[PDB]
Amino acid sequence: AKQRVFIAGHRGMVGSAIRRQLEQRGDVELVLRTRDELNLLDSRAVHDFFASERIDQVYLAAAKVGGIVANNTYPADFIYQNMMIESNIIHAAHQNDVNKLLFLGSSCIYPKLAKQPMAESELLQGTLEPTNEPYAIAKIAGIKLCESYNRQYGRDYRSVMPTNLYGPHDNFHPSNSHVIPALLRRFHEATAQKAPDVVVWGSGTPMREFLHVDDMAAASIHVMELAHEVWLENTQPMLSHINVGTGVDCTIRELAQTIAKVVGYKGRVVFDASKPDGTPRKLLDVTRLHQLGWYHEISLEAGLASTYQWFLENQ
Amino acid sequence: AKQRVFIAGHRGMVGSAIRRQLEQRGDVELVLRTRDELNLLDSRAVHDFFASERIDQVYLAAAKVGGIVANNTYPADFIYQNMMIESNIIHAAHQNDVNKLLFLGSSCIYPKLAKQPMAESELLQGTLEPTNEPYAIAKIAGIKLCESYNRQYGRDYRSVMPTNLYGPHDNFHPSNSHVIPALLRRFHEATAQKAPDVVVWGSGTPMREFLHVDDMAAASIHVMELAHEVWLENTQPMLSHINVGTGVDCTIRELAQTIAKVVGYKGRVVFDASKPDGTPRKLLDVTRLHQLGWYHEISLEAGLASTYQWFLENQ
Ligand SMILES: NC(=O)c1ccc[n+]([C@@H]2O[C@H](COP(=O)([O-])OP(=O)(O)OC[C@H]3O[C@@H](n4cnc5c(N)ncnc54)[C@H](OP(=O)(O)O)[C@@H]3O)[C@@H](O)[C@H]2O)c1
Ligand SMILES: NC(=O)c1ccc[n+]([C@@H]2O[C@H](COP(=O)([O-])OP(=O)(O)OC[C@H]3O[C@@H](n4cnc5c(N)ncnc54)[C@H](OP(=O)(O)O)[C@@H]3O)[C@@H](O)[C@H]2O)c1
């Protein structure tokens, strides 16, 4: 009997990445519902789905996600919708004897002034970035729902905290606040237009971390499928999440120059240092994941190149 | 037209305190539903109630609450039920054009190693007490739901963070982890039995803060009814909650000796200092509330005496 695996949010960036890998697995039967078929905000509908579809495992990749403008403009929508989706799925899963779930956090969940690189223990150690506060609180509440169900009911609801992601199915619009898809699109257009330069705000000095979504999906399946005793040995019940990333930083400068090369731009990348930089360094400590035997396979250069080719095929 | 005021959880300790004060108000029409009439976990039922009952203001005093054993034994129930009750009420209120709401936090929401006395700005500055973590995360999510609805939709969803409360309608069982009702009952029984001593764990040295629930209710109505511009001047949109307490500490020793006197116990109060004390001091900074023009009226001695008389009438 193949395991029946529900990938919530399977048309999303991360959900689709997990689907492309599991779609290859003869030991897995995927159960998929679009938003039109199942509105994850509707408690009744979510319970009815779990009460009729005989699910074994859930990948919780459904969420209301956006960039800086969206998070500051629709804060109520970000906190409410994520709290409801998470609560409805985790509670319905439990009520229907679904023992295995993988929840997705976000690195934006860590305190603004966290110690770098950020180990899992940085969670809740200080105040949040205001732009992401509503979203972050709902994501932290999701982790704590999983841990609470694990502790009270002996569930196996695991969680992963990705770093910045990029890859197929992203939003490739020049005004995206997420730097990889924005820069890919900006450099693509500047290359098409023969623009003499592309100006990036800031000095280029801050160090950040990036992981291709197919690596994220692989790590998530890896973490989901570890035997429970191994997962327990490398986590704590009230500190259960696992950072997923490279553990390696690169300057914004390096990233922009690499994107320029990947797209074949021959103008100048220019940084405007009159605009402020964020903190000097932000990256995850991925010791737990590496101790668990998973290491990322996609280098930045290779991942940016394949991402750009996906964009070119999907304009 | 009297304001139509829904007191969610009106048979609870705090809800009933607010009801006893508003029941005197000819400018207010109370709308009350017991749990059997309206299950606040049921999104559909909550929306239907708001879509039919023409509410002007909500006091959100419904919650899953307990002591140390309950919070550690049923963590999933504490986080899930509080997230759902809060989400359902705040979202339904907003969808039905209910502009005014008062949410109740809890002082247990502050970081374990917070700076004392704890100003509102201590929220989220550090890790939580593990016993209360699930509950605390759902309460913090409730504050952040209110702030997000205020920011996105221009609502007036205010919040109060009470200190330790005591008074009528508490749980007066000797094994209650809440020290006032437990000690009242233990000393009452030791007085009835002529027991030679009553032994309290710990040294008696820690300093804590206590507020009678009728003072809490008065402060909550006060905060609810301030003009918006005054409330805005004394809060910030993403730091909106108001501590409610005395701002004055007393040792556990003082509290126990006072309870002994109030009950007329003539045996010895004994502290067993072989058992550990918690942190040396925990109390709220109530500068915001005092600046808002509210000061508590019930002294510890007077409040303990009237609480004990309520117990004696309700055994
Ligand atoms: N670097 C990081 O730290 C990082 C970055 C990205 C993602 N992640 C994690 O991955 C999660 C997903 O991100 P993503 O980039 O894959 O988001 P996404 O591409 O925006 O996908 C989320 C999916 O959820 C669905 N969804 C939302 N509300 C739903 C509802 N009410 N009913 C049913 N489906 C609903 C979607 O449908 P519609 O579009 O039709 O609404 C969308 O397909 C994030 O929340 C975060 O936990 C973390
Ligand atoms: N010192 C402090 O910091 C402190 C202390 C106490 C309270 N407070 C605040 O006051 C809040 C209330 O505390 P409390 O002591 O008044 O609690 P309580 O006495 O236990 O009352 C809560 C009320 O909510 C109701 N309720 C719970 N789930 C419901 C549901 N699904 N549908 C409808 N009604 C439901 C109740 O009904 P049932 O009993 O029938 O379940 C109970 O009447 C706390 O959450 C906290 O925010 C803070």
XYZ file of C-alpha atoms and ligand atoms in Angstrom:
726
model
C 0.000 0.000 0.000
C 1.551 3.233 -1.169
C 1.553 5.992 1.449
C -1.198 8.547 0.680
C 0.480 11.946 0.826
C -1.447 15.202 0.859
C 0.662 18.139 -0.364
C -1.311 21.174 0.809
C -0.623 24.146 -1.494
C 0.766 21.929 -4.251
C 0.671 24.612 -6.950
C 2.786 26.936 -4.819
C 6.509 27.360 -5.294
C 7.531 24.988 -2.505
C 4.513 22.670 -2.806
C 5.145 22.164 -6.497
C 8.838 21.410 -5.859
C 7.846 18.691 -3.354
C 5.255 17.375 -5.861
C 7.807 17.134 -8.687
C 10.047 14.941 -6.522
C 7.326 12.736 -5.007
C 5.551 12.316 -8.362
C 8.514 10.097 -9.151
C 7.942 7.793 -6.137
C 6.099 4.542 -6.757
C 5.780 4.151 -2.992
C 3.700 7.314 -2.849
C 0.150 8.177 -3.878
C -0.294 11.939 -4.067
C -3.565 13.487 -2.935
C -3.886 17.012 -4.309
C -6.646 19.618 -4.124
C -6.514 23.059 -5.738
C -7.808 26.056 -3.791
C -11.017 25.916 -5.847
C -11.545 22.290 -4.732
C -10.624 22.811 -1.083
C -10.476 26.159 0.712
C -8.066 25.493 3.582
C -9.555 28.374 5.572
C -12.870 26.477 5.869
C -12.598 24.271 8.952
C -15.575 22.148 7.958
C -14.232 21.519 4.463
C -10.792 20.576 5.786
C -12.237 18.160 8.324
C -14.469 16.575 5.662
C -11.473 16.099 3.371
C -9.456 14.339 6.085
C -12.499 12.314 7.180
C -12.894 10.928 3.653
C -9.475 10.686 1.985
C -7.445 8.302 4.127
C -4.264 10.412 4.319
C -1.021 9.021 5.783
C 1.239 12.112 5.585
C 0.774 15.840 5.056
C 3.243 18.362 3.639
C 1.840 21.699 4.803
C 2.980 23.965 1.968
C -0.168 26.117 1.766
C 0.181 29.677 3.099
C -0.509 33.333 2.400
C 2.951 34.578 1.364
C 4.219 37.864 -0.042
C 6.948 40.462 -0.042
C 7.577 43.644 1.894
C 4.704 45.715 0.474
C 2.219 42.874 0.885
C 3.218 42.055 4.456
C 2.953 45.701 5.558
C -0.230 46.410 3.605
C -2.317 43.357 4.491
C -1.065 42.391 7.967
C -4.441 41.077 9.162
C -4.733 38.812 6.123
C -1.226 37.414 6.698
C -1.722 36.558 10.364
C -5.370 35.382 10.153
C -5.111 33.281 7.013
C -1.920 31.500 8.096
C -3.226 30.850 11.611
C -6.441 29.373 10.184
C -4.864 27.238 7.469
C -2.332 25.813 9.949
C -4.867 25.246 12.746
C -7.395 23.651 10.427
C -4.924 21.234 8.856
C -3.059 20.201 12.006
C -6.235 19.712 14.051
C -8.038 17.857 11.262
C -5.006 15.661 10.663
C -4.917 14.750 14.362
C -8.680 14.109 14.543
C -8.342 11.730 11.596
C -5.309 9.813 12.863
C -2.841 11.287 10.418
C 0.385 10.769 12.362
C 2.968 12.383 10.082
C 3.067 16.017 9.000
C 5.809 18.375 7.815
C 5.216 22.057 8.506
C 7.068 24.876 6.743
C 8.400 27.841 8.702
C 10.367 30.720 7.230
C 13.714 32.213 8.275
C 11.955 35.544 8.649
C 10.493 34.002 11.925
C 13.829 34.546 13.753
C 14.475 37.693 15.812
C 15.710 40.737 13.880
C 18.937 40.966 15.973
C 19.582 37.202 16.180
C 23.080 35.793 16.674
C 24.616 34.655 13.348
C 24.636 32.121 11.979
C 21.191 31.463 13.436
C 20.839 28.147 15.244
C 17.355 26.814 15.899
C 17.616 28.021 19.471
C 17.434 31.644 18.299
C 13.624 31.204 17.910
C 11.814 33.567 20.289
C 15.012 35.076 21.690
C 14.110 38.659 20.745
C 11.786 40.920 18.830
C 10.740 40.338 15.232
C 11.247 42.431 12.087
C 8.148 44.636 12.006
C 7.454 44.117 8.325
C 7.115 40.355 8.869
C 5.751 40.336 12.418
C 2.161 39.245 11.716
C 3.242 36.501 9.315
C 6.044 35.413 11.653
C 3.739 35.107 14.654
C 1.384 32.888 12.675
C 4.330 30.738 11.524
C 5.692 30.464 15.078
C 2.190 29.481 16.215
C 2.250 26.719 13.552
C 5.542 25.315 14.888
C 4.092 25.430 18.405
C 0.869 23.722 17.284
C 3.026 20.892 15.880
C 5.107 20.608 19.053
C 2.022 20.692 21.255
C 0.264 17.930 19.292
C 3.519 15.929 19.406
C 3.745 16.354 23.198
C 0.089 15.821 24.120
C -0.910 13.201 21.585
C 2.338 11.537 20.555
C 2.099 12.796 16.987
C 5.009 13.066 14.564
C 4.479 16.618 13.261
C 7.905 17.846 12.117
C 8.912 21.271 10.871
C 11.494 22.833 8.605
C 12.657 26.457 8.526
C 13.913 27.379 5.071
C 16.319 30.203 4.295
C 15.657 32.492 1.310
C 14.432 30.370 -1.570
C 14.494 30.826 -5.337
C 13.738 28.711 -8.400
C 10.960 27.682 -10.747
C 7.491 29.045 -10.085
C 8.689 32.178 -8.336
C 7.291 35.647 -9.130
C 9.635 37.131 -11.756
C 8.470 40.745 -11.679
C 10.988 43.599 -11.439
C 9.274 45.100 -8.428
C 9.353 41.890 -6.370
C 10.993 42.656 -3.039
C 12.673 39.213 -3.154
C 16.092 39.968 -4.618
C 16.714 36.845 -6.774
C 13.564 36.877 -8.914
C 13.610 40.680 -9.039
C 17.215 40.845 -10.148
C 16.827 37.995 -12.652
C 13.945 39.908 -14.251
C 15.653 43.339 -14.042
C 18.862 42.031 -15.594
C 16.902 40.114 -18.235
C 15.115 43.327 -19.266
C 18.289 45.454 -19.078
C 19.983 42.899 -21.335
C 17.067 43.024 -23.801
C 17.046 46.831 -23.724
C 20.842 47.251 -23.855
C 20.590 49.463 -20.735
C 24.014 50.869 -19.763
C 23.590 50.050 -16.068
C 21.313 48.497 -13.475
C 21.335 50.281 -10.132
C 20.789 48.276 -6.960
C 19.986 50.075 -3.707
C 22.560 49.761 -0.964
C 26.258 49.109 -0.840
C 26.221 45.435 -1.764
C 28.084 44.491 1.408
C 25.399 42.624 3.414
C 25.768 38.865 3.496
C 22.743 36.641 2.875
C 21.961 32.979 2.202
C 20.002 31.446 -0.664
C 18.789 27.914 -1.410
C 17.203 26.581 -4.592
C 13.658 25.349 -4.017
C 14.458 21.868 -5.411
C 17.087 21.518 -2.659
C 14.468 22.739 -0.193
C 12.006 20.101 -1.418
C 14.648 17.360 -1.194
C 15.588 18.364 2.359
C 11.906 18.473 3.359
C 11.258 14.962 2.048
C 14.466 13.820 3.750
C 13.368 15.272 7.078
C 9.826 13.890 6.703
C 11.102 10.366 6.059
C 13.806 9.987 8.750
C 12.886 7.400 11.322
C 11.247 9.005 14.308
C 13.961 7.931 16.740
C 16.625 9.620 14.613
C 14.542 12.812 14.322
C 13.976 12.769 18.101
C 17.719 12.362 18.780
C 18.497 15.499 16.805
C 15.699 17.748 18.016
C 13.966 18.610 21.334
C 10.181 18.475 21.855
C 9.857 22.224 22.426
C 12.708 23.079 20.017
C 11.774 20.753 17.191
C 12.257 22.662 13.954
C 15.178 22.085 11.575
C 16.851 24.883 9.598
C 17.137 24.145 5.891
C 19.781 26.063 3.930
C 23.390 26.038 2.810
C 24.893 27.593 5.924
C 27.000 29.697 3.563
C 26.729 33.393 2.946
C 27.362 35.624 -0.001
C 27.304 39.354 -0.389
C 24.477 41.053 -2.270
C 27.282 42.287 -4.518
C 28.344 38.738 -5.347
C 24.733 37.736 -5.963
C 24.007 40.646 -8.292
C 27.257 40.180 -10.246
C 26.525 36.459 -10.586
C 23.002 37.101 -11.834
C 24.384 39.606 -14.346
C 26.761 36.938 -15.658
C 24.053 34.228 -15.753
C 21.773 36.452 -17.863
C 24.601 37.630 -20.146
C 24.225 41.318 -19.227
C 27.140 43.392 -20.518
C 26.234 46.708 -18.897
C 27.348 47.719 -15.400
C 25.932 46.539 -12.096
C 25.893 49.671 -9.939
C 25.280 49.914 -6.196
C 23.872 53.101 -4.705
C 25.361 53.269 -1.232
C 23.291 56.334 -0.363
C 20.494 53.859 0.387
C 20.681 51.861 3.585
C 21.750 48.383 4.026
C 20.012 45.906 6.279
C 21.967 43.998 8.923
C 25.445 42.906 7.884
C 24.790 39.184 7.998
C 21.811 36.860 8.058
C 22.104 33.109 7.569
C 20.987 29.843 9.114
C 23.146 27.445 11.077
C 22.415 24.108 9.394
C 24.341 21.872 11.787
C 21.201 19.911 12.722
C 20.323 19.175 9.106
C 23.889 18.161 8.219
C 23.989 15.909 11.326
C 20.793 14.354 9.960
C 22.691 13.471 6.778
C 21.390 15.981 4.266
C 23.575 18.422 2.358
C 22.421 20.724 -0.447
C 23.397 19.814 -3.995
C 22.667 22.951 -6.037
C 25.320 25.646 -6.072
C 24.292 29.269 -6.458
C 25.738 29.531 -9.961
C 24.081 26.316 -11.136
C 20.777 27.133 -9.452
C 20.640 30.662 -10.834
C 21.374 29.353 -14.338
C 18.670 26.709 -14.223
C 16.221 29.165 -12.668
C 16.838 31.648 -15.429
C 16.308 28.931 -18.052
C 12.977 28.077 -16.374
C 12.009 31.772 -16.539
C 12.969 31.944 -20.218
C 10.696 28.959 -20.925
C 7.797 30.463 -18.930
C 7.608 34.165 -19.843
C -29.763 53.312 21.540
C -27.862 51.411 24.185
C -24.582 49.917 22.968
C -24.977 46.148 22.394
C -22.071 44.518 24.206
C -21.131 40.880 23.752
C -19.155 39.519 26.720
C -17.636 36.310 25.353
C -17.045 33.830 28.202
C -19.403 35.674 30.545
C -19.628 32.868 33.107
C -15.851 32.815 33.494
C -14.040 34.526 36.333
C -13.111 37.650 34.378
C -16.163 37.627 32.085
C -18.508 37.473 35.044
C -16.681 40.356 36.765
C -17.147 42.513 33.638
C -20.819 41.413 33.468
C -21.491 42.379 37.098
C -20.246 45.916 36.421
C -21.919 46.426 33.029
C -25.207 44.894 34.221
C -25.511 48.138 36.146
C -25.199 50.342 33.021
C -28.406 51.646 31.483
C -26.375 52.696 28.449
C -25.497 49.070 27.793
C -27.440 46.089 26.475
C -25.604 42.864 27.258
C -25.624 40.046 24.720
C -24.625 36.783 26.384
C -24.383 33.206 25.123
C -23.359 30.210 27.231
C -21.023 27.616 25.730
C -24.035 25.357 25.127
C -25.686 28.143 23.081
C -22.579 29.175 21.154
C -19.412 27.104 20.775
C -16.745 29.728 20.074
C -14.547 27.121 18.387
C -17.121 26.747 15.574
C -16.283 29.381 12.965
C -19.647 29.059 11.250
C -21.579 29.460 14.493
C -19.549 32.513 15.507
C -20.045 34.181 12.140
C -23.794 33.459 12.247
C -24.035 34.997 15.715
C -22.299 38.205 14.604
C -24.299 38.285 11.355
C -27.564 38.259 13.317
C -27.057 40.015 16.663
C -26.044 43.574 15.821
C -23.101 43.825 18.247
C -21.338 47.147 18.922
C -18.539 46.006 21.280
C -16.953 42.711 22.289
C -15.160 41.832 25.526
C -13.185 38.717 24.607
C -13.118 36.915 27.958
C -13.582 33.370 26.616
C -10.489 31.138 26.754
C -9.166 27.726 27.723
C -7.372 28.507 31.004
C -5.734 26.342 33.652
C -2.857 25.906 36.047
C 0.544 24.278 35.833
C -0.611 20.653 35.532
C -3.241 21.523 32.935
C -0.921 23.622 30.782
C 1.765 20.909 30.716
C -0.676 18.031 30.265
C -2.925 19.412 27.527
C -0.624 21.748 25.568
C -2.315 21.108 22.208
C -5.724 21.945 23.666
C -4.403 25.205 25.154
C -2.795 26.490 21.963
C -5.444 25.238 19.484
C -8.547 26.242 21.409
C -7.281 29.743 22.230
C -6.057 30.360 18.679
C -9.443 29.291 17.286
C -11.632 31.190 19.740
C -9.593 34.379 19.213
C -9.400 34.042 15.415
C -13.083 33.242 15.081
C -14.250 36.162 17.209
C -11.889 38.824 15.864
C -12.455 37.870 12.220
C -16.226 37.576 12.628
C -16.361 40.889 14.465
C -14.469 42.564 11.612
C -16.615 40.927 8.907
C -19.714 42.241 10.673
C -18.488 45.800 11.227
C -17.964 45.480 14.950
C -15.396 48.232 15.481
C -14.627 47.911 19.194
C -13.166 44.879 20.942
C -11.183 44.342 24.146
C -8.904 41.311 24.175
C -7.472 39.758 27.342
C -3.828 38.712 27.508
C -2.117 37.252 30.552
C 1.100 38.291 32.312
C 2.386 34.777 31.735
C 2.862 35.938 28.038
C 6.026 37.902 28.988
C 9.495 36.342 28.687
C 10.639 34.215 31.635
C 13.736 36.424 32.244
C 12.013 39.773 31.576
C 13.270 43.015 33.114
C 11.247 43.966 36.232
C 8.910 45.607 36.612
C 7.734 44.482 33.180
C 6.797 47.301 30.821
C 4.695 46.480 27.779
C 7.818 46.579 25.653
C 9.073 43.369 27.284
C 6.655 41.408 25.012
C 8.642 39.113 22.708
C 12.022 40.140 24.118
C 13.037 36.601 25.111
C 11.951 33.025 25.569
C 8.780 31.980 27.365
C 8.228 29.870 30.491
C 7.897 26.342 29.107
C 4.885 25.432 31.204
C 2.884 28.291 29.660
C 4.466 28.395 26.205
C 1.580 26.988 24.139
C -1.008 29.151 25.897
C 1.270 32.197 25.729
C 1.861 31.843 21.995
C -1.878 31.712 21.371
C -2.383 34.803 23.565
C 0.424 36.685 21.792
C -1.175 35.701 18.475
C -4.454 37.221 19.763
C -2.756 40.550 20.559
C -1.161 40.491 17.105
C -4.488 39.672 15.427
C -5.946 42.772 17.129
C -3.028 44.984 16.092
C -3.117 43.676 12.535
C -6.859 44.317 12.147
C -6.311 47.784 13.658
C -3.517 48.524 11.157
C -5.070 47.048 8.009
C -8.717 47.876 8.559
C -8.711 50.796 10.979
C -10.391 48.796 13.727
C -10.329 49.673 17.420
C -9.374 46.285 18.905
C -7.676 47.033 22.238
C -5.985 44.648 24.637
C -5.238 44.370 28.325
C -2.605 42.210 30.026
C -3.658 41.366 33.568
C -1.311 40.375 36.375
C -2.233 37.475 38.683
C -5.926 37.701 39.461
C -8.049 36.450 42.348
C -11.621 36.895 43.562
C -15.118 35.505 43.228
C -15.646 32.600 40.858
C -12.107 31.295 41.133
C -11.308 27.594 41.671
C -10.957 27.150 45.448
C -9.399 23.687 45.540
C -6.326 22.989 47.687
C -4.385 21.575 44.774
C -4.884 24.624 42.536
C -1.478 25.804 41.362
C -2.704 29.422 41.671
C -1.488 30.455 45.115
C -4.369 32.707 46.306
C -7.306 30.327 45.845
C -5.160 27.369 46.907
C -3.966 29.055 50.066
C -7.419 30.423 50.929
C -8.784 26.873 50.713
C -5.805 25.249 52.507
C -5.948 27.740 55.369
C -9.738 27.440 55.553
C -9.435 23.654 55.950
C -6.488 23.888 58.378
C -8.566 26.294 60.470
C -11.541 23.897 60.419
C -9.297 20.947 61.292
C -7.231 22.788 63.928
C -4.073 21.697 62.050
C -0.915 22.830 63.890
C 0.770 24.134 60.734
C 0.391 24.663 57.006
C 3.581 24.119 55.035
C 4.181 26.144 51.886
C 6.908 25.087 49.455
C 9.780 27.502 49.039
C 11.339 30.181 51.162
C 8.599 32.784 50.899
C 11.024 35.381 49.559
C 9.881 35.773 45.918
C 7.941 38.926 45.165
C 4.735 38.747 43.122
C 1.788 40.970 42.203
C -1.924 40.316 42.646
C -5.058 42.172 41.533
C -8.669 41.501 42.495
C -10.795 40.545 39.497
C -13.304 43.367 40.160
C -10.420 45.843 39.765
C -9.446 43.989 36.596
C -12.997 44.307 35.252
C -13.114 48.022 36.107
C -9.780 48.666 34.380
C -10.924 46.696 31.317
C -14.126 48.722 30.984
C -12.083 51.889 31.526
C -9.658 50.949 28.764
C -12.478 49.878 26.422
C -14.292 53.194 26.835
C -11.426 55.721 26.524
C -11.736 57.834 23.426
C -9.713 56.377 20.605
C -7.410 59.385 20.316
C -6.460 59.090 23.988
C -5.843 55.333 23.652
C -3.726 55.974 20.536
C -1.647 58.627 22.345
C -0.706 56.153 25.054
C -0.031 53.085 22.936
C 1.728 52.233 19.629
C 0.083 50.274 16.787
C 2.459 47.316 17.093
C 2.840 47.708 20.883
C -0.791 48.273 21.759
C -1.520 46.269 24.890
C -1.914 47.821 28.350
C -0.722 46.128 31.551
C -3.385 45.949 34.242
C -2.204 45.506 37.837
C -1.126 47.339 40.960
C 2.529 47.773 40.050
C 3.291 46.776 43.637
C 4.900 43.596 44.826
C 4.620 41.500 47.923
C 6.503 38.474 49.090
C 4.860 35.051 49.061
C 5.540 35.161 52.799
C 3.485 38.328 53.204
C 0.696 36.861 51.085
C 0.522 33.604 53.030
C 0.630 35.365 56.419
C -2.111 37.747 55.274
C -4.311 34.898 54.078
C -3.777 33.132 57.408
C -4.971 36.256 59.225
C -7.962 36.768 56.886
C -9.174 33.197 57.503
C -8.536 33.356 61.267
C -5.998 30.501 61.272
C -4.161 30.260 64.593
C -1.654 27.562 63.656
C 1.735 28.287 62.084
C 2.461 29.201 58.485
C 5.641 27.281 57.670
C 7.876 27.664 54.620
C 9.973 24.742 53.423
C 13.047 26.334 51.900
C 14.341 22.970 50.699
C 11.983 23.456 47.747
C 12.973 25.908 45.051
C 11.777 29.338 44.557
C 10.915 30.812 41.193
C 12.490 34.080 40.056
C 12.938 36.686 42.772
C 10.524 39.226 41.348
C 7.720 39.319 38.817
C 5.381 42.281 38.431
C 3.919 44.552 35.785
C 4.874 48.152 35.152
C 1.493 49.903 35.078
C 2.701 53.347 34.024
C 0.588 53.282 30.845
C -2.601 52.450 32.723
C -1.966 55.084 35.405
C -1.226 57.660 32.658
C -4.609 56.677 31.211
C -6.210 57.675 34.521
C -7.022 54.351 36.131
C -5.735 53.248 39.522
C -6.781 50.097 41.387
C -9.096 50.492 44.363
C -8.955 47.127 46.152
C -6.084 46.563 48.548
C -4.749 43.058 49.065
C -6.119 42.825 52.600
C -9.569 44.071 51.594
C -9.674 41.939 48.453
C -8.585 38.777 50.241
C -11.224 39.351 52.932
C -14.041 39.867 50.458
C -12.849 36.925 48.365
C -12.873 34.671 51.381
C -16.397 35.824 52.271
C -17.488 34.973 48.704
C -15.939 31.502 49.116
C -17.719 31.014 52.445
C -21.044 31.841 50.761
C -20.348 29.487 47.825
C -18.885 26.276 49.282
N 13.213 31.655 2.499
C 12.180 31.219 3.244
O 12.330 31.254 4.480
C 10.927 30.822 2.667
C 10.604 31.290 1.389
C 9.464 30.801 0.694
C 8.605 29.890 1.323
N 8.911 29.408 2.507
C 7.937 28.558 3.113
O 7.124 27.954 2.160
C 5.755 28.352 2.417
C 5.115 28.439 1.062
O 5.739 29.430 0.254
P 5.577 29.528 -1.278
O 6.661 30.463 -1.737
O 5.549 28.123 -1.886
O 4.098 30.234 -1.432
P 3.222 30.217 -2.686
O 4.108 29.887 -3.874
O 2.676 31.495 -2.614
O 2.310 29.025 -2.430
C 1.401 28.816 -1.359
C 0.209 27.993 -1.958
O -0.840 27.890 -0.950
C -2.101 27.935 -1.541
N -3.060 28.472 -0.614
C -3.059 29.651 0.108
N -4.210 29.848 0.746
C -4.979 28.718 0.475
C -6.310 28.378 0.830
N -7.087 29.147 1.610
N -6.774 27.185 0.387
C -6.000 26.438 -0.428
N -4.791 26.736 -0.907
C -4.312 27.899 -0.404
C -1.991 28.623 -2.808
O -2.940 29.106 -3.648
P -3.270 30.459 -4.345
O -2.074 31.106 -4.905
O -4.307 30.153 -5.337
O -3.652 31.426 -3.237
C -0.471 28.607 -3.191
O -0.640 27.645 -4.206
C 5.988 29.692 3.117
O 4.840 29.961 3.894
C 7.191 29.453 4.057
O 6.772 28.605 5.170
C 9.931 29.973 3.267
N -3.183 37.004 36.044
C -3.475 36.928 34.732
O -2.586 37.294 33.940
C -4.706 36.368 34.249
C -5.417 35.501 35.084
C -6.719 35.048 34.736
C -7.275 35.413 33.503
N -6.640 36.258 32.720
C -7.233 36.504 31.445
O -8.603 36.266 31.466
C -8.895 35.227 30.498
C -10.036 34.454 31.092
O -9.667 33.845 32.326
P -10.675 33.297 33.357
O -9.883 33.085 34.618
O -11.893 34.221 33.432
O -11.107 31.853 32.694
P -12.362 31.048 33.039
O -12.871 31.524 34.387
O -11.850 29.757 32.952
O -13.346 31.509 31.971
C -13.236 31.410 30.559
C -14.697 31.210 30.025
O -14.636 30.932 28.594
C -15.623 30.020 28.225
N -15.199 29.277 27.070
C -14.052 28.540 26.838
N -14.106 27.878 25.685
C -15.322 28.244 25.108
C -15.958 27.824 23.912
N -15.403 26.970 23.038
N -17.167 28.373 23.641
C -17.734 29.199 24.544
N -17.262 29.549 25.741
C -16.025 29.048 25.971
C -15.982 29.236 29.385
O -16.718 28.103 29.506
P -16.548 26.689 30.135
O -15.932 26.741 31.469
O -17.883 26.080 30.113
O -15.468 25.991 29.324
C -15.474 30.034 30.635
O -16.768 30.432 31.025
C -7.552 34.495 30.471
O -7.474 33.814 29.237
C -6.483 35.610 30.503
O -6.470 36.301 29.216
C -5.313 36.598 32.964
